[PDB]
Design a protein around this ligand. Sequence first.
Ligand SMILES: CCCCCCCCCCCCCC(=O)O[C@H](CCCCCCCCCCC)CC(=O)O[C@@H]1[C@@H](NC(=O)C[C@@H](CCCCCCCCCCC)OC(=O)CCCCCCCCCCC)[C@H](OC[C@H]2O[C@H](OP(=O)(O)O)[C@H](NC(=O)C[C@H](O)CCCCCCCCCCC)[C@@H](OC(=O)C[C@H](O)CCCCCCCCCCC)[C@@H]2O)O[C@H](CO[C@]2(C(=O)O)C[C@@H](O[C@]3(C(=O)O)C[C@@H](O)[C@@H](O)[C@@H]([C@H](O)CO)O3)[C@@H](O[C@H]3O[C@H]([C@@H](O)CO)[C@@H](OP(=O)(O)O)[C@H](O[C@H]4O[C@H]([C@@H](O)CO[C@H]5O[C@H]([C@@H](O)CO)[C@@H](O)[C@H](O)[C@@H]5O)[C@@H](OP(=O)(O)O)[C@H](O)[C@@H]4O)[C@@H]3O)[C@@H]([C@H](O)CO)O2)[C@H]1OP(=O)(O)O
Ligand SMILES: *[C@@H](O)[C@@H](COC(=O)CCCCCCCCCCCCCCCCC)OC(=O)CCCCCCCCCCCCCCCCC
Ligand SMILES: *C(=O)CCCCCCCCCCCCCCC
Lengths: 517, 150, 390
Amino acid sequence: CDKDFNAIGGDLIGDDHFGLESEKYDVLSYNQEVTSVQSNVLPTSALGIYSNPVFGETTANYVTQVALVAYAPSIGEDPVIESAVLSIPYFSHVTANNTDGSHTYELDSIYGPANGKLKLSVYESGYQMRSSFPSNGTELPQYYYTSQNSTFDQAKVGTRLNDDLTKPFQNDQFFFSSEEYKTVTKDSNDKETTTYTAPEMRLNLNSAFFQDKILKAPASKIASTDVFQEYFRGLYFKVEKADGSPSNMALMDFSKGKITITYKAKTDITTDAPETTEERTIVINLVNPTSSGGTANLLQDAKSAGYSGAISSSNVNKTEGDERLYIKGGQGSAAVIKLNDFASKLDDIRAKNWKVNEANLIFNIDSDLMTGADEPKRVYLYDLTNNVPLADYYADQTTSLTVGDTKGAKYVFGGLINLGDNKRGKTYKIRITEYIRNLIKDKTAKNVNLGLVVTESIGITTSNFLENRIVLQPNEYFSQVPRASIMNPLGTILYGGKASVPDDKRLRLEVYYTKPN
Amino acid sequence: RGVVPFERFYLGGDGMANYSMDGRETIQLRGYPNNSLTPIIEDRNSSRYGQQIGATIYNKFSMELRYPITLKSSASIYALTFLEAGSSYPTFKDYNPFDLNRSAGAGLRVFMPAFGLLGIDFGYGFDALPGSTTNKANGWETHFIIGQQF
Amino acid sequence: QQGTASPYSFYGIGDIKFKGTLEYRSMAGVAVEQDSIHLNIENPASYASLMQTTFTVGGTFGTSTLKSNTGSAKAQRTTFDYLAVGIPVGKFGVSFGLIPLSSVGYKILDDNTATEGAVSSQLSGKGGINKVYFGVGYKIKPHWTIGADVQYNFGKITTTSIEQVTGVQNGTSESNASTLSGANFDLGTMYQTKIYKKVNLFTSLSYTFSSNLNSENVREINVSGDPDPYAYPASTTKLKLPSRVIIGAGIGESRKWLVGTTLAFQGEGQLTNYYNAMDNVRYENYAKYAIGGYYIPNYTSFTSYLSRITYRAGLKYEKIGLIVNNESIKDVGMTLGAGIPIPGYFSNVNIGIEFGKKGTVSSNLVQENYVNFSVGFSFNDKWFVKSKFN
Ligand SMILES: CCCCCCCCCCCCCC(=O)O[C@H](CCCCCCCCCCC)CC(=O)O[C@@H]1[C@@H](NC(=O)C[C@@H](CCCCCCCCCCC)OC(=O)CCCCCCCCCCC)[C@H](OC[C@H]2O[C@H](OP(=O)(O)O)[C@H](NC(=O)C[C@H](O)CCCCCCCCCCC)[C@@H](OC(=O)C[C@H](O)CCCCCCCCCCC)[C@@H]2O)O[C@H](CO[C@]2(C(=O)O)C[C@@H](O[C@]3(C(=O)O)C[C@@H](O)[C@@H](O)[C@@H]([C@H](O)CO)O3)[C@@H](O[C@H]3O[C@H]([C@@H](O)CO)[C@@H](OP(=O)(O)O)[C@H](O[C@H]4O[C@H]([C@@H](O)CO[C@H]5O[C@H]([C@@H](O)CO)[C@@H](O)[C@H](O)[C@@H]5O)[C@@H](OP(=O)(O)O)[C@H](O)[C@@H]4O)[C@@H]3O)[C@@H]([C@H](O)CO)O2)[C@H]1OP(=O)(O)O
Ligand SMILES: *[C@@H](O)[C@@H](COC(=O)CCCCCCCCCCCCCCCCC)OC(=O)CCCCCCCCCCCCCCCCC
Ligand SMILES: *C(=O)CCCCCCCCCCCCCCC
C-alpha cells in the first residue's frame, strides 16, 4: 500500500527540460453566401415556413417521386375507390402513458411557434425526374437545386388533391398535430382491436383522381417503375401562410410516406358469381430520398437586412476579414477560415523542434445580436480546398456520454454549443490538434482553406454541390457544402478575426506547445 | 548475435513444470495471473506490441509457514501461509533484483498416493501488472494445481 | 515497489539502503566482535570466523512522515533487504550475496487544477544501485583474521516528470534513465584480545577503495497523442564512488555483554549526474558515529527462555554528505532489537525497530521522521562432514 502521492519536497527536485506554453495566432475569416445547392439526396427535408427574427423567413417546399410496392397489379373487376389517405409519420416521442391504453406524444423537430398554421397544398407533379442522364460518353448524375421551386410549381397539373373542404385542418388551416389516431375494429369475430398509430400527417386526397389514375388506368402504365413514374411523375408539396395565424416549419422523413387507396372489386368469384364485392388496397409509396434522386427540397429564404448586408459581396473583406460571421444552414452562408499567420511562422516552429500538445479555435457568439432566435446546437469545420473532413474528425472516436445521443459524438473534436447559465449560447470550440501537427511534422503538407458551417448531425459528412461554383480567389473555388448544413435551417452569428475586434472576443488560433530546452 | 529466443523465463500464476522441450520455464508467483509478469513488447508501433517475448533474468523470494493437520501415508494434508516477491527482466542492463512484485495469502495442500498432490491457494497481489496505466494493486487471485508444478 | 519515499533520494545515487544485517543493524552497525553464526558483510575478515554454513535473508517495513514548512505527509515502504551465504572452508571463509547499495524513490504531486491555464507536475523516481559481492577471509591467527572482497555495482535510476496544463488534455512526460555499472574492492581485519578476566577487547578495521561508475543516460520527451517522441542524443557520464574507512572498538564478555563504538569516514566522490545537477545542493564527506552493544542475561539457561534472547541497542549520528540550501543534512536515530534462537539449532530470528529523524524543516528543506520494523532470518548448518566407517 504505497501507491499514494504527496505534495512534500517538490522544490528539491530539479526542473524539467521542456516548456509547456501556448501561442496565439490571427485568423482570416470572411463570409461567403451559399447559392442554390443540391437538395436531391437529403435524408431529412423541411416542409413549412419558419420566421427567424435575425436571419429572416424561409419557406420550404418538397417534391418527390411516387412508386408502387408491386408493379403490374391486379386491381380487379369493377373497382370502386372508397378512400385515398396519405400518411407521413412525424418525428415524435411518447411523453405520458395514459390509462385505457393510448399514449400522449410531443412533436419533435418543429421549428417556430407551436400554434402556427400553414396552408398546405398537395399537387400532382408534371415534371419528370431522373436520377442520372447520359452525356457525351459519360453517365452524369442528376441534381435538383433549392432554387428550382418555380420549375416544379409551373409544371403542376390540376388542383390540390387535399381538397376536402369539410376538414379545414388538412387544407387552408393545416397544422402539425400530435394525435394518436385511435382505431377500433370489431372484426375479431365480435371482439374489438384497439390499435394506435403514432402522430402522422393524414390527408384525404381526391377520390375521383385516384379512381382513373390507378383503379381505372391502362395496364400499360402501371406495368413497371419506368412507365409508372412517367405516368404519375410525383407529388408536389406547397406551403403558404394561413389566414391570421403564424407559421412553423418541421423536418420530416418522407421515405416512410405513402398513400393507400382503399377500394372494392368484384372478387375472384366464379363460385357464387353474384354482384358481391371484396375490399382491396393498393399502396403508392414515396421514393426514398437516399436510394433515389427524384426528391428535391425547394428552400426559399427572405434574408433580413442585417444578414443580407453582411453576406453581400460589397461588405466582405477578403484581405483583412469580417468582424461578424453569419453562418446559416440550408441555402444560407458559410465562413472561410485561413490560418495565414500560423503558416508564416511555420518555418520557425518546425526548426525549433516544438511539439503541439493541443490546438483549438474558439468561436464566440454575439449574444447581443443573436437574441430571441433559436441557436444551432453544433457547428462543423471541414476542409474547403479538398471538401473532405479534417484529420481531427477521423482521429476522434469519442461517443456521446448520454445513451442514444448520436448527435453529441466526437466531443473531443468540438463544435458543440457551450450554453451559459442564461440557457443561451456562449461559444463553440473546435480542436484541430491533428491538423496542426501534420503541418509542422510534414514539410510537403500545405495549409488548406477551412470552412465553418452549421451542422445537423456529425455523422453525415457527405457534401452537396452548388449549381454554379464560386471563385473565392484566382485559383480557389467554393463548389460544395456539407450535406448536414443544408438540412439545418438555423444559423448563428460569431465574432470575426479582424484586428478591430476586441482581443477578448476576436477569433484566433491558440496552440499549446512543448518547447524542449 | 543477441540472446536466443528459446530457453526463456515466464513468471506469474500457478506455475508449471518443465514439460516443454524448448527450455521454457514457468515460475509461480501467487497473487498474479499466469504469465502476467513476463516482459512485453513495448515498441507500440512494431505490429507486435503487447506480446510476451520472454524474460532472460528472474529472481523469486518466498517465505512460508506450514502447519500439518494430517501426515499419514493414506493422506497428508497441511496448511500454509506465504509472503512472496518476484520479478522478471528482459536484459541484464534492466536487472533490478530489489524491484519486485509482492504478494501474500494462504493455501491448503492435500496429498493422496492415488490422486497425487492437490493444492488450492489464495494470493493477493500488492502491485500492478506490467503495462497498466493505473498504479493499482492486482488484487485477489485463486490458484489450483495438481502435482509438483515446480 | 520503491524502496524509499524521501525526496533527498533524487540527489547523488539515492539513499543508502544497506547498513548491515539485522543482527548488526540493530546495534547501529557496530560489528567489532568476531561472531561464529552471523555474517558481517561490511567486513570481509569476519568470513573466516564462521563455524557453520550461514544463509541470511532480511526484509523491512518502513513508515515515514515527510514534514516541511507547508504541510506534512505520511509514507510507507516495504522492501527486501539482503541475501547472503557464508561457507567455512578450513582456515578460510567464503561469502557471496546480493545487497542494495542505494535506492531512489519519491512520488511528489503539485496539484494546480481548478484553475484554467495552470501547469500540474507529477514528479516520480525509481530504481537504485545494487551490489554483488564475493569475499574470502583467512585466520592469520586463532583470534586475528584478515580478508578481502570484490563488489560489482549495477542498477538503473529512472526519473520521470509529467506536466499537464489544466485546460488541454494532452500533457508531456519527460523521462531520464541512467544505467550504472562498476566494481570496487574492500579490505578488512579483525583482532580480539583479553584485557581483563573474562573481558575481551574487540577491534576491527575495514577499508573500501574508490571505484568508477559508468552511467549511460537516455532522456526522451513524450507528449500525449503524438506518436513520435523527441529523444536526446545518448550520453555517458563517469561517477566516482568515495572510499570508506570503518574503525571499530569495543569491550565485553562473549555471550554475556558487549559495548562498542564505530567511526566511518568517506573520501571524495562524484555522485552528480546530468539530471541531478543543481546549484543550491553541494556535497561533503560522509561521517558516521555510532555506539551500540548487546546483552544476554543467561545464554545457558534452562528455566526461562527470555534469558537466552540477545537484546541489542544502538545510537547513531550520520552526516549524509550533501549540503542543501547551505544546510548539512544529518540523520540521527536509535535502534533496538532482539535475537530469538530457534531451540535445538544455532539458527535464529532477528527482530528490530529503528526510529530517527533525517533532514530539517529550516531553509525550506524537508524533515523525515521514520519508524522502521525489520525481520531477519539467520540459518546455520554444519556441512562438509566426512563419514568414516567405510
Ligand atoms: C565471474 C563470474 C562469471 C561472469 C563472467 C563475466 C565477467 C567477465 C567479463 C565480462 C565483460 C565482457 C564485456 C565484453 O566486452 O564482451 C561482452 C560479452 C561477454 C561474454 C561473457 C560470457 C559470460 C560467460 C558466463 C558463463 C557462466 C557459466 C559483450 C560486449 O562486448 O558488450 C559490451 C557492453 N558490455 C556488456 O554487454 C556486458 C553485460 C554483462 C554480460 C555478462 C553478465 C554475466 C553475469 C552472469 C553471471 C551470473 C552468475 C550467477 O553488461 C550488462 O548487461 C549489465 C551488467 C550485468 C549485471 C550482472 C548482475 C549479476 C547478478 C548476479 C546475482 C547473483 C559494454 O558496456 C560497457 C561495459 O561493459 C561491461 O559492463 P556493462 O555492460 O556496463 O554492465 C564491462 N565489464 C564487465 O565486466 C561487466 C560484467 O557484466 C561484470 C560481470 C559481473 C559478474 C557477476 C558475477 C555474479 C556471480 C558471483 C557470485 C559471487 C564494463 O566495465 C566496467 O566498468 C565494470 C568493471 O570495471 C569491469 C570488471 C568487473 C568484473 C567483475 C568481477 C567479478 C565480481 C563478481 C562478484 C562481485 C564496461 O563499462 O558496451 C560495449 C559497447 O561498446 C561498443 C561496441 O560494441 O563495439 C564500442 C564503444 O566504443 C568505446 C570504445 O571504443 O572504447 C567504448 C567505451 O570505451 C567508451 O570510451 C566509448 C565512448 O564513450 C564513445 O564515445 O567508446 C561504442 O562504440 C563506439 O566505438 C568506436 C570507437 O572508435 C570510439 O570512438 C566508434 O568508432 P569510430 O567512430 O569509427 O572511431 C563507434 O562509432 C562508429 O560506429 C557507429 C556505427 O556506424 C556502427 O554501427 C553499430 O555498431 C557498433 C559496433 O561497435 C557493435 O559491435 C555499435 O556499438 C554501434 O552503437 C552501432 O549501433 C557510429 O556510431 P554513432 O555516432 O552513429 O552513435 C559512428 O558513426 C561510427 O561509424 C562508436 O562511437 C559503443 C556504442 O556507443 C554502443 O552503441 O559500442 C559492448 O562491447 P565492447 O566495446 O566490446 O565492451
Ligand atoms: C492496504 O490496502 C493494505 C492491503 O489491503 C488488502 O487488500 C489486504 C491484503 C491481503 C492481506 C493478506 C491476506 C492473506 C492473509 C495472510 C497474510 C500473510 C502472512 C504471512 C506471515 C508468515 C510468512 C509466511 O495494505 C496492507 O495490508 C499492508 C501490508 C504491509 C505488510 C508489512 C509487513 C510485512 C513484513 C515485512 C518484512 C518483509 C517480509 C519478509 C521477511 C523475511 C525477510 C527475507
Ligand atoms: C503495499 O506495498 C503493502 C506491502 C506489500 C507486501 C509486503 C510483503 C512483501 C513480501 C516480501 C518477501 C521477501 C522474501 C521472504 C523470504 C525470502
